[PDB]
């Protein structure tokens, strides 16, 4: 990453490398893996972002889809900012430069700590997370329509499933079971989730 | 977080990220998870507080209730402090800015290290903990009325349960079993818990 | 904690938070948990001491007894030092201020690093350890009178039990078994534990 | 490694040493072990690169092949840059010097931090990774021709295998099973992997 | 401990605290626990040395013997250096001061960093290790006389046992079995252990 | 160790202490334990090298052989450099001084950071590794002559064993099984291991 000591490059740590690999192995593309990726890639250069993605062993269908999303975003960067060199001067980053493909670490360090800074780490991380959210949604096994409360299912457990599915992807009342549904209609409109959950406790 | 080096931003650590996720997985909304959250979010920016909350995989009914509490507190912040920009000047944080929704990391860094400082990390953490205490209370399985000492239950074990339930949520004497209750009445008023626990040992 | 960088505040660490919670879970109120608590709370502010105590999940009968001891010590602090404010000046800490109840972190930082320093961290830690020793003694299952050497028990194992019990709470010779007791009387007075343990090997 | 404090030598860490050894033990020469090696050897001297390779216990057929690749690259370095000494002056690194065989740590430190720098760590790491990719390819058990979708195999699982094999080493459509193949031909040309994977969901 | 930043006090770490406790739990008073104790107590104050000893849960017979050895050494310190105060001046450390019993942390910090330094940490550690070696020897289960090579025991395994016992507490040839003994006598005098071990391989 | 802050002494870490002890316990005197020892003892003083060796619990036959090798090297140091004191001046290190036996930590710190430096840490580490390689070779269970490819053994597995044995201690072709041997002779002379391994795949 780049961090303060002045902004300087620091090695990505064994802890960070390990953390990311393990979260992917344990959680796959569960929605909460996105904020974890983002946190572990704090201050990350494009080389670091590529390093973290490369260390993943499985899920190569997903990694391939991620490359496609990244390519799309790179072509849009080049559409918006066409790259136009003078000796010892900073060059303009194209799409592939931001994705760490055609840029060196020094060039990446140069853009990020420049004044004004060109945050190629954050621009790339945005493309990656955009791609990762597309995968999270695809790998979501259940539609929100299929999430309904079972006759003996505690209301809490049903809501946990409802917003879990919704995160990946008055309907809550519709899909509640008959008993709790009657209690919820009795509360009327403008009832908070807290009040609903207490009412069906 | 923000810490001293001067106040500067530091990345949230893999240890901290991991610690929080594991405590939630192991303890759910047991009362003691609140002080742990608060300690792990020491010096935290709103982005950090959102990051920690986002990394939680389950409990989305609870996370939804937390958003509701946060919204309520945000509307009260905007009621108390209406946001009213001049070039290169610091803007006033509204409710959603404190919750990290409509504020950047730089703006957050700017408010927190300003002189005088606007501690948006602590103001937000207060809203979160307020919401988290509401959940702790809701998920408490047992009422204090139902906590009574069994005929062969050691008095210590009963008191452990009594104050455990009470933390989530002369009654102690009333709910004691006949044998220990007689010993406790014999001690009279103004007996400390220590003396009570020794008397029924 | 407060440590040198100048004396400055540092966040309590995930390692420290975890260490304390695990020692309590594994050892409960075994005597050796007191020196571990004291070591893990090195340089601790009252907020830190409260944080460590709060993160404990079980043992709420004990935590309640601890509050009682702390209250007693707070009332004695207020008896000895009655608190008597001038703008931008340091105020005098009362009992509840030392216990972190009515004091902010800044006020705590202010007292501790002041010249001359008012060590509210150490004064509070003393009250806590005083309370913790009272609990260690209470939860000690065996009296030293009941610790006696079994007919086939190695003398070493018996002494391990004898001083273990004694830590929580020529008697050693009296409670030794007949065979080893005769050997010990033959050594006469002024025999060291080493010589006793060798003589009954 | 060499890192900023000025560029200075730092010891390779127990965490780093352990990380590398464990990844090799768990993953052998799975493709993703290359980016992990590269990340763990960030800022590494030739001595460090040799240290990491030496700590590997098994896979000595592979380590021998790696030496061969390294020798080949060393002979090409000597072909391109023949080494031609003056007292207290820096000497020119030959092939074996870059590979850490005939160079001391001080000489390595000297080349790397020189102005202009001769990055012997990165030049050597390139030779090593070049050798490691040759092994990854050799130890790949399956040809991409043999990767075909089973009649009841989810399309996602088949693509995971397809790009996994391809990483080690409209064919994707050809090797799909009859049912999904018909759906894919119906999409026409220029369909993204995302659309293909959704179409066969 | 005390370390360089100038010599300043640093908190004993959770890693260090944990390491010591675990080594004692796993190895008891195996000989190699002494050098581990010494390494973990590097730069340690008397308070730190007492902290490490206090955190040990079992082995209170041994800890009691350790106190006895320490007392003996303290009385010898007071015999050699009788303590003879002037305002704001450093006082002379007596036996109990070195053992951390009657000395504060500040006084300990004062002696250790004084010029010339009075290394009370090292003087105390010497008393402790002297006591610990006495225990290692006592808890050694086997005499070296009883260590003899079994008829089918590999010579290496026998020598491992021989020097293991010897560490706790031409004899090696005498106690070797008939077959290997004849081979060893054939080597003559002045044969190294290496040659002996090869000869009986 | 000694490291840069200026060259200053730092405590050997719990991580480092633990790492070494565990590698010995898991790998004994497998060849790869030598480079691990060397890496973990980076910047080590003789006291540190002795500390690491002392913390090893088993293998006392080997540790004894190591002392013998060290003694031999010490006598050669004294043969080459006879030690010949002036107040407050640095003395000349003899054999036993380099081995940490008759030298203090301060004297060791003094030699190592002197200008010009006398690297007693590296000179001693060389003696130790020289001794450790002698043990690795001795404890190697299999001769390279006994390593031959089984009739159904994959060629890769055989080569792994061949160079494993060779590390501890056209022969590769001779010891290959009939089928693969014919393929290898057909390749002719000057075939690389890569080509051989592919040819017998
Ligand atoms: O140099 C690299 N550029 C990206 C990359 C590589 C190819 C592509 O079509 C899009 C992005 C990448 C990746 C990568 C790996 C998995 C998912 C996304 C990007 N790894 N290394 C690189
Ligand atoms: O940008 C964010 N703002 C909050 C948030 C998001 C929505 C809302 O109604 C209240 C607060 C939040 C959260 C969040 C997640 C779980 C519980 C509480 C807040 N995560 N990210 C953000
Ligand atoms: O703000 C606090 N003050 C103490 C406290 C709280 C109440 C009391 O009667 C005595 C001390 C405390 C504790 C606490 C918890 C368990 C045991 C001892 C003190 N946690 N937070 C606080
Ligand atoms: O000093 C060294 N130089 C390399 C090396 C050693 C021999 C060779 O033919 C090529 C490279 C090496 C290695 C090594 C070990 C395994 C794989 C590759 C290089 N370990 N130490 C050294
Ligand atoms: O303040 C202390 N002084 C020593 C001590 C305590 C009593 C004694 O007779 C000798 C040394 C000690 C110990 C201690 C504990 C176990 C073994 C050796 C010393 N713990 N705390 C203290
Ligand atoms: O002070 C010491 N000097 C060495 C040592 C001790 C005796 C000897 O004959 C050779 C070297 C050593 C060792 C040691 C232990 C195991 C193997 C090699 C050296 N531990 N402490 C010391």
Rounded-to-10 torsion of CA D24, D27, D31, D37: -30
Residue keyed to tokens 């031909």 = D185
**What determination technique applies here?**
X-ray
Closest CA to D20 of D7, D44, D5: D44
What is the phi-psi region of residue C147: left when phi exceeds 0, alpha when psi lies from -120 to 50, beta otherwise?
beta
Contact (Cβ atoms closer than 8 angstroms) between residue C122 and residue C96: no
Closest-CA distance, A87 to chain B, in angstroms, reads 33
The total of other beta-carbon atoms located within 10 Å of residue C4's CB is 13
D68-73 LR contacts (CB < 8 Å, sep 24+): D68/D131, D68/F192, D68/F193, D68/F194, D69/D127, D69/D130, D69/D131, D69/D134, D70/D99, D70/D127, D70/D128, D70/D131, D73/D126, D73/D127, D73/D130
Of F16, F30, F194, the CB nearest to D57: F30
The SS3 call for residue B56 is: coil
From chain A, pick out residues whose CB is under 8 angstroms from the CB of B29: none
Euclidean distance between CA atoms D134 and F190, whole angstroms: 19
Other Cβ atoms within 10 Å of D5 Cβ, number: 9
According to CATH, the superfamily of the domain at C144-201 is Retrovirus capsid C-terminal domain (1.10.1200.30)
> Which DSSP letter does residue B99 get?
T
Phi and psi at residue C8, to the nearest 5°: -135, 155
List all residues whose CB is within 6 A of at least one atom of ligand 5: E 50, 53-54, 63, 66-67, 70-71, 99-101
> In what helix (H) or strand (E) does residue D7 lie, and over which residues does it extend?
strand D7-9
User: Which tokens is D58 given?
Assistant: 């098994």
**Helix, coil or strand: residue B33:** helix
Side-chain half-sphere CA neighbours of E130 within 13 A: 14
Backbone angles phi, psi at F195, to 5 degrees: -70, -45
Question: CA of A134 to nearest chain B CA: how many angstroms apart?
Answer: 18
Using CA atoms, how far apart are residues E186 and E172, in angstroms rounded to an integer? Answer: 15
Contact between F156 and D61 under an 8 Å Cβ cutoff? The reply is yes
Residue with tokens 């990844």: D23
- Name the region of D190 (left: φ>0; alpha: ψ -120 to 50; beta: rest): left
Please enumerate residues of A whose Cβ is less than 8 A from a Cβ of B: 1, 3-4, 13, 15-16, 18-19, 27, 30-32, 34-36, 38-40, 42-43, 156, 159-160, 162-164, 166-167, 192-194, 197-198
For every residue of D11-46, DSSP letters joined together read: PPPHHHHHHHHHHHHHHTT-TTHHHHHHHHTTT--H
DSSP assignment, residue E4?
E
Question: Whose structure tokens read 């009739």?
Answer: F151
Residue D197: closest CA among A59, A126, A162: A59
How many residues are present in chain A? 201
Give the three-class secondary structure for B150.
Answer: coil
Q: Write down the residue that tokens 């390819």 correspond to.
A: D137
Strands of chain C, DSSP E: 2-4, 7-9
How far apart (Å, rounded) are the C-alpha atoms in residues E56 and C23?
12
As beta bridge partners, residue B2 has B9
Burial class (CB in 10 A: 0-12, 13-18, 19+), E151: exposed
Q: Which atom of ligand 2 is nearest to the CA of B68?
A: 9
Which residue's alpha carbon is at the smallest distance from atom 17 of ligand 3?
Answer: C63
Closest Cα of chain D to F88: distance in Å? 30
Phi, psi of F142 (to 5 degrees): -115, 140
DSSP three-state, residue E45: coil
| Residue F101 DSSP SS3 | coil
Q: Which residues of D touch F4 (CB under 8 A)?
A: 5, 8-9
Gyration radius of chain A over CA positions: 23
CA distance C112 to A105: 46
Angstroms from B157 CA to nearest CA on chain C:
8
Q: Which residues of chain C come before a gap where C and the next N are over 2.5 Å apart? A: 5, 84, 169
The encoded tokens of residue A157 equal: 């457990």
Q: Which residue, chain included where needed, has tokens 């931001």?
A: A98
In this structure, what are the phi and psi dihedrals at residue F4, rounded to the nearest 5 degrees? Answer: -80, 145
CA distance linking residue A87 with residue A97, whole number of Å: 19
Instruction: Tokens for E198, please give them.
Output: 């090869």
DSSP helix/strand/coil, C142: coil
State in Å, rounded, how far the first CA of chain D is from the last one: 48
Q: Assign 3-state DSSP to chain C and report helix, strand, coil percentages, each to 5.
A: 60, 5, 35
Please tell me which residue of chain E has the smallest CA distance to C34.
Answer: E55
Are A99 and A160 spatial neighbours (Cβ–Cβ below 8 Å)? no
Quote the tokens at residue B24.
């939630």
Q: Residue D191: exposed, middle, or buried by beta-carbon count in 10 A (0-12, 13-18, 19+)?
A: middle
Residues facing residue B9 across a β-bridge:
B2
How many whole angstroms separate alpha carbon B20 and alpha carbon B48? 12
Q: Which residues contact A200 (CB under 8 A, 6 or more apart)?
A: A155, A176, A180, A183, A184
Q: Residue A150 burial by CB count (10 A; 0-12/13-18/19+): exposed, middle or buried?
A: exposed
Other beta carbons within 10 angstroms of residue B131's beta carbon come to 23
Find all residues with CB under 8 Å of C4, minimum gap 6, and list them: E5, E8, E9
What is the C-alpha separation between E173 and F191, in angstroms, rounded?
A: 52
Q: Give the number of whichever ligand sits closest to the CA of residue D74.
A: 4
Mutate to test the interface with F, among D3, D14, D56 (most CBs of F within 10 A): D14
Contact D3 A10 (CB under 8 A): yes
Strands (E) across B80-136 are located at none
Cα–Cα distance, E106 to F15 (Å, whole number): 29
- Whether omega for the bond prior to residue D32 falls within 30 degrees of 0, making it cis, is no
Q: Can you tell me which residue has the tokens 């061969």?
A: D68
Q: Which residues are registered as beta bridge partners of F9? A: F2
- Asked if residue B65 lies in contact with residue B131, where contact means CB atoms within 8 angstroms, the answer is yes
Distances (CA, A) of D36 to A50, D161, E10, E80: 11, 21, 35, 61
If you take atom 3 of ligand 3, which residue's CA is the nearest one?
C101
Contact between residue A17 and residue D41 where contact means Cβ atoms under 8 Å apart: no
CA angle E113, E128, C26 (to 5 degrees): 100
Which bin fits B158, alpha (ψ -120 to 50), beta or left (φ > 0)?
alpha
Contact yes or no, F with A (3+ CB pairs under 8 Å): no
Cα diameter, chain C:
76
Alpha-carbon gap: F152 to the closest alpha carbon of chain D (Å): 18
Who's near B186: CB < 8 A, 6+ residues apart? Answer: B199
Q: Which of D60, D28, C200, E34 is nearest to F159 (CA)?
A: D60
Phi, psi of C44 (to 5 degrees): -80, 140
E100: region left, alpha or beta (phi > 0 left; psi from -120 to 50 alpha): left
3-class DSSP string for chain E: CEEECCEEECCCCHHHHHHHHHHHHHHCCCCCHHHHHHHHCCCCCHHHHHHHHHCCCCCHHHHHHHHHHHHHHHHHHHHHCCCCCCCCCCCCCCHHHHCCCCCCHHHHHHHHHCCCCCCHHHHHHHHHHHHHHHHHHHHCCCCHHHCCCCCCCCHHHHHHHHHHHHHHCCHHHHCCCHHHHHHHHHHCCCCCHHHHHHHCC
Distance between first and last Cα of chain A: 48
Nearest to C61 among B4, B39, B159 (CB): B159
Chains with 3+ CB–CB pairs under 8 A to C are B, E
The minimum CA-CA distance between F87 and chain E, rounded to whole Å, is 16
Domain ranges of chain D: 1-143, 144-201
How many A from CA of E44 to the centre of ligand 5?
Answer: 15
CB pair distance less than 8 Å for F35 and D55? yes
- Subunits next to F (3 or more Cβ pairs <8 Å) are D, E
Peptide bond into D36 cis (omega under 30): no
Q: What Å distances lie between residue E83 and C33, E46, E80, E92, F90, CA to CA?
A: 35, 18, 10, 6, 34
- Give the fold, CATH level 3, of A1-143: Human Immunodeficiency Virus Type 1 Capsid Protein (1.10.375)
CB contact under 8 A, A65 and D164: no
**Which of E125, A169, F13 has the alpha carbon at shortest distance from B60?**
A169
With contact defined as 3+ CB pairs under 8 Å, the chains touching D are A, F
B2 contacts: CB under 8 Å, gap ≥ 6: B8, B9, B10, B43, B45, B109, B112, B113, B121
**Nearest-CA residue of chain C relative to B16?**
C14
Q: Residue B149 is encoded by which pair of tokens?
A: 């000492």
Q: Pick from E125, E122, E123, E111: which is nearest to E7 by CA?
A: E111
Contacts of E2 (CB under 8 A, 6+ apart): E8, E9, E10, E43, E45, E109, E112, E113, E121
Query: Are A61 and D162 in contact (CB < 8 Å)?
Result: yes
Give φ, ψ of B183 to 5 degrees.
-65, -40
Q: Under DSSP, is residue F2 helix (H, G, I), strand (E, B) or coil?
A: strand
Ligand nearest to the CA of C167: 5
Which of E18, E20, E60 best tests the C interface by mutation, with the highest count of C CBs <10 A? E60
Q: Which residues, other chains included, contact B189 with Cβ-Cβ below 8 Å and sequence gap of 6+? A: none
Give F176's DSSP letter: S
| B1-143 and B144-201 share one fold | no
Decide whether any atom of ligand 6 lies within 6 Å of the F51 Cβ: no
Interface touch E193/F64, C-beta < 8 Å? yes
In Å, what is the CA distance from B54 to each residue of B11, B63, D162? 16, 9, 33
For residue B100, give both structure tokens: 């990290």
Q: Which pair of structure tokens corresponds to residue E46? A: 């008397």
Could you tell me the CA-to-CA distances from E200 to A63, E155, E156, E165, F143 in Å, in that order?
59, 6, 8, 21, 17
Provide, as residue numbers in chain D, all residues whose Cβ is less than 8 Å from the Cβ of F27.
57
Query: Rounded to an integer, what distance in angstroms lies between the CA atom of residue E104 and that of residue E46?
Result: 9
F39 close to D17: Cβ distance less than 8 angstroms: yes
- Residues 6 or more apart whose CB falls under 8 angstroms from that of E5 comprise C4
Q: Which ligand has its closest atom nearest to the C-alpha of B124? A: 2
Orientation of helix F46-54 relative to helix F105-113, angle to 10°: 130
Q: Which listed ligand is nearest to C31 at the C-alpha?
A: 5
- Between CA E65 and CA E1 the distance in angstroms is 25
Question: D35 and A55 in contact (C-beta within 8 Å)?
Answer: yes
Mutate to test the pocket of ligand 4, among D29, D53, D78, D98 (most ligand atoms within 8 A of CB): D53
Give, using CA atoms, the residue closest to atom 5 of ligand 3.
Answer: C67
Q: Please give the Cα distance from E201 to F6 (Å, whole number).
A: 50
Beta bridge partners of A4: A7
Residues 6+ apart with CB under 8 A from F71: none
Angstrom distance (rounded) from CA A10 to CA A17? 13
Physical contact, E and B (3 or more Cβ pairs within 8 A): no
Query: Six-digit token pair at F118?
Result: 């006398």
Question: Would you tell me how many other CB atoms lie within 10 Å of the CB of residue B183?
Answer: 15
* Cβ E2 vs Cβ E109: under 8 Å: yes
Alpha helices in chain D (DSSP H): 14-27, 33-40, 46-54, 60-80, 95-98, 105-113, 120-139, 155-168, 171-174, 178-187, 193-199
For chain B, after which residues does the C atom lie more than 2.5 Å from the next written residue's N, i.e. where is it broken? 5, 84, 169
- CA-angle at D70, arms to D66 and D76, nearest 5°: 150
The strand pairing partners of C4, in sequence order, are C7
Contact B65 A19 (CB under 8 A): no
**D47: its two tokens:** 């001595």
Sign of CA dihedral B39, B44, B50, B51: negative
How far, in whole angstroms, is CA A137 from its chain's centroid?
Answer: 11
Q: Which of A155, A164, A152 is nearest to A184 (CA)?
A: A155
Report which DSSP code applies to F13.
Answer: P
Can you tell me whether residue A9 is helix, strand or coil?
strand
Contact D111, D124 (CB under 8 A): no
Give chain D positions within 8 Å (CB) of F166. Answer: 60
Residue E160 CB neighbours (<10 A): 18
CA–CA distances in Å: residue C182 to residues A181, C148, C173, C177, C190: 82, 15, 9, 9, 16
Q: In this complex, do D51 and F38 lie within 8 Å of one another by their Cβ atoms?
A: yes
Please note each residue after which chain E is broken, C-to-N distance over 2.5 A, or write none: 5, 84, 169
CB distance C163–E60 less than 8 Å? yes
- Identify all chain F residues contacting E1, using CB atoms and an 8 Å cutoff: 11
Cα separation, C22 vs C28, in Å, equals 9
Count of pairs with CB atoms under 8 A, one residue in E, one in F: 75
| Contact (CB, 8 A) for F127 and F73 | yes
In the numeric block, which tokens belong to residue D86? 């003056």
User: Which residues in chain C have their CB less than 8 angstroms from residue E22's CB?
Assistant: none
C-alpha distances in Å from residue A39, one per residue of A59, B50, B51, B52, D84: 21, 10, 7, 9, 50
Rounded to whole angstroms, the Cα distance separating C195 from B33 reads 52
The torsion angle over the Cα atoms of residues A25, A30, A32 and A33, rounded to 10 degrees, is 40
Residue B44 CB coordination number (10 Å): 25
Shortest-distance Cα residue to atom 7 of ligand 2: B67
Q: How far apart are alpha carbons B122 and B128 in whole angstroms? A: 10
CA distance A54 to A159: 36
CA distance C92 to C13: 29
| Euclidean distance between CA atoms F201 and F197, whole angstroms | 6
CA B185/CA B200 separation, integer angstroms? 11
CA of A157 to the centre of ligand 2 (A): 21
Closest CA to D138 of F195, F151, F148: F195
Min Cα separation E6/chain C (Å): 11
Number of residues that this document lists for chain D:
201
């Amino acid at each position: 990453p780049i961090v303060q000591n002045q902004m300087v490059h620091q090695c990505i740590s064994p802890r960070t490398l390990n953390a990311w690999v393990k979260v992917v192995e344990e959680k796959a593309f569960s929605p909460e893996v996105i904020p974890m990726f983002s946190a572990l890639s704090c201050g990350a250069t494009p080389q670091d972002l590529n390093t973290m993605l490369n260390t993943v062993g499985g899920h190569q269908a997903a990694m391939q889809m991620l490359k496609e999303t990244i390519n799309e975003e790179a072509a849009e960067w080049d559409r918006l900012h066409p790259v136009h060199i003078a000796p010892g001067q900073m060059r303009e980053p194209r799409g592939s430069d931001i994705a760490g493909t055609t840029s060196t670490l020094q060039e990446q360090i140069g853009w990020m700590t420049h004044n004004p800074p060109i945050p190629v780490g954050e621009i790339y991380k945005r493309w990656i997370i955009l791609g990762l959210n597309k995968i999270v949604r695809m790998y979501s096994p259940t539609s929100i329509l299929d999430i309904r409360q079972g006759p003996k299912e505690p209301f809490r457990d049903y809501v946990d499933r409802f917003y879990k599915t919704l995160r990946a992807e008055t309907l809550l009342v519709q899909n509640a079971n008959p008993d709790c549904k009657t209690i919820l209609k009795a509360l009327g409109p403008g009832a908070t989730l807290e009040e609903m959950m207490t009412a069906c406790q």
